[PDB]
Design a protein around this ligand. Sequence first.
Ligand SMILES: COc1ccc(C(=O)CN2C(=O)NC(c3ccccc3)(c3ccccc3)C2=O)cc1
Ligand SMILES: COc1ccc(C(=O)CN2C(=O)NC(c3ccccc3)(c3ccccc3)C2=O)cc1
Ligand SMILES: COc1ccc(C(=O)CN2C(=O)NC(c3ccccc3)(c3ccccc3)C2=O)cc1
Lengths: 263, 263, 263
Amino acid sequence: MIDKSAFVHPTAIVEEGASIGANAHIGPFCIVGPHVEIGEGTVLKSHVVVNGHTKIGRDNEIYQFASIGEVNQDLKYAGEPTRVEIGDRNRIRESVTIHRGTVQGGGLTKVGSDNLLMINAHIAHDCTVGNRCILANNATLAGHVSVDDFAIIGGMTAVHQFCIIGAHVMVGGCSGVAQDVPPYVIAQGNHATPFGVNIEGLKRRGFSREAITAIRNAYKLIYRSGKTLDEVKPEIAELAETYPEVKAFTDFFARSTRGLIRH
Amino acid sequence: MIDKSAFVHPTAIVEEGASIGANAHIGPFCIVGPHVEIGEGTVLKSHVVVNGHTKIGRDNEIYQFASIGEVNQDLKYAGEPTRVEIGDRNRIRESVTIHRGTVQGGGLTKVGSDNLLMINAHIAHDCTVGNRCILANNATLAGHVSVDDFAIIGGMTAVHQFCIIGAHVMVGGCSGVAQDVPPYVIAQGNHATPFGVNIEGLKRRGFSREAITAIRNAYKLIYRSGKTLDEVKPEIAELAETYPEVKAFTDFFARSTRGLIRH
Amino acid sequence: MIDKSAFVHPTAIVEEGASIGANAHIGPFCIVGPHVEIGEGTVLKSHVVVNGHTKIGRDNEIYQFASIGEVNQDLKYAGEPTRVEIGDRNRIRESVTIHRGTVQGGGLTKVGSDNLLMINAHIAHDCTVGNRCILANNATLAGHVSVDDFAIIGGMTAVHQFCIIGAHVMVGGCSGVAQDVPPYVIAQGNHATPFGVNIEGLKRRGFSREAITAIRNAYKLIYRSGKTLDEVKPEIAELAETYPEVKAFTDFFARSTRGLIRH
Ligand SMILES: COc1ccc(C(=O)CN2C(=O)NC(c3ccccc3)(c3ccccc3)C2=O)cc1
Ligand SMILES: COc1ccc(C(=O)CN2C(=O)NC(c3ccccc3)(c3ccccc3)C2=O)cc1
Ligand SMILES: COc1ccc(C(=O)CN2C(=O)NC(c3ccccc3)(c3ccccc3)C2=O)cc1
């Protein structure tokens, strides 16, 4: 149902069954499907399409010409009732596309909270975007991509299907990411290669000097020691016995399927 | 006229003279010009602009914020009544742009059937897209570009004006194609260079082992023999005397104007 | 107020306080904010959002799904009443985004006259675009970017924040510009590097043979002499004592903050 304190523009079309929370705002020429849930305080500026089985949280701002929940572009998708989940306080700018999952991929495309999704950013079927991320203009996630917390993806950058963008990563603009990017790393180029630890981001987010140093040492194990990833895995787990921030590497290794970006 | 079995949303604006076929669906806030023809069963989801002298076939799906038939971006275009032709069973996703031709270019932008045109794909004036193609997100065809049957263009890839993308080609994402790509070839990079025969695609599309081998040999003639294209042209026509699939090269050579992509 | 000779489509929403000039045309499903000024003869085709403190001049054409004046994407912006200025006779194609300034950046995003802004071109907060420019499909200006008169930016090209694109520059498509581009120069690649003087453009725009030669000599001073920019600055000012066209370099040097693109 539509909360009595929500606003639906007379020109918007909210189909029966849609759930609109208190003090939400559905602007002019919006289309909201019958399986959509829009949380308290969320704003659809105008000309927004939201359909499918789509759950949107609180205090989001979705700008004109965005397409949220829409049928995905996977070649095998056949209309199965998959899902989209979007959290809270996200800013979803003009022409962003966020597509529903595929049965084969797990049925869910998920976006966290406090993200900035810039003009024409694309979140393909079965992607998982975390919290406090930034996807710049025209940043494109192919199917099944994970972008972990605080990760930043520069403008005009594409992420190859199934890849993982680790937490606190920064991918420079105009890059093509064809493999997995470990947490805390700067990547850039096409194909993208690693350019060290995102020190400035770790600074600004309150990482201690000891944590940044341990992370930098974990970086050197992976990329400078010359040892294989299998040799360095216990060495990094060892270092994480003292510096818990280094565990992000261990958890990341367990999920990686396409290998790490390398130079 | 509008067929009695077609649906036009009360908020859509279909101008007098438009031709809407049986069981077509013009969704909310669509704009359909007086010279537009939309074939049986085609769906305009919502917020779709279709204008100019534009013929659209059967069972197409055109998603919100697409612009079909619109004035092209050629610097000399001056409003002449050029045309767009689109065939059947195409999926034209959010924000795709397909622009009318130019007098100088021949007056026609043409798209075949069974194509998937992903988010923000661009088909410039005077382009010819064949059947069963895929243009991924942000794939951009400049003016006068040909994309032949089954060709696939990866996301964020641009094709330079007048270039030809041969049949069964695969262009990797994040690539810039500045010259013609022969049939059956994989291209990638920026500028794009050839990376062999698209064997997997030829497999999946029912090419025989003999056909793939002859094609691979035609590839080696062009790119490994060291002979000039003029020397290899009769050698490829010779090989096509036995393997008709190799004729695609001959027909492609007759159309190529910008030279082949080379390494 | 809305001029008696202006046309506002019954489905458009022009908020009280908007200023619409004579023989302007606000098409279907457009949204025009109360602080917007639209000059004589300007056309909003359909599905156009224009808001904020936005001044738009005469004889512009703004195509469907464009977002003009909208809140910028700068991470510190907090809703301050910044501004957009757009001049005359601009063609602003589908899905173009032009965002308002930031207090910190000077409060103004400005676009000149006689520009062609192609599909999905982006003009970030605090940018200055001059006169007679071309931004091709998906050309993206980050914040605080200047694009000087007659400059052309190829499709899928991004300009890094704070950079200057000099007058009569040509940036090839699929390029990433991370530093300032001097007037009259061709740039291309990623990162973009200089490829000589834009001779053909200077030809077509009426530059004399003497002017092109002096410009070419100024190019060689910067990029071939091997001298530092500080050594060449008085040499270029010297050459400009005879060839006033060379002064564009001097004025450009005074504004450059990110260094010149180099090979
Ligand atoms: C070297 O740096 C990079 C970076 C990114 C990529 C890619 O994204 C490559 N790529 C997919 O992984 N899926 C895509 C697709 C295209 C055609 C047919 C099937 C699947 C795709 C992309 C975006 C949206 C939708 C579909 C596609 O082009 C490649 C290389
Ligand atoms: C090395 O790899 C590549 C791949 C692709 C390209 C290009 O596409 C280069 N290029 C055109 O051929 N026409 C464009 C244009 C821009 C400015 C003025 C006139 C024409 C264009 C592109 C797309 C849509 C509309 C217009 C443009 O930028 C270049 C290099
Ligand atoms: C080597 O060639 C190039 C060319 C261009 C660039 C860039 O544009 C790099 N870049 C910014 O300068 N600002 C961006 C941003 C992203 C994330 C967080 C803050 C700011 C941005 C871009 C476009 C629109 C909005 C924001 C961003 O990605 C880099 C390299």
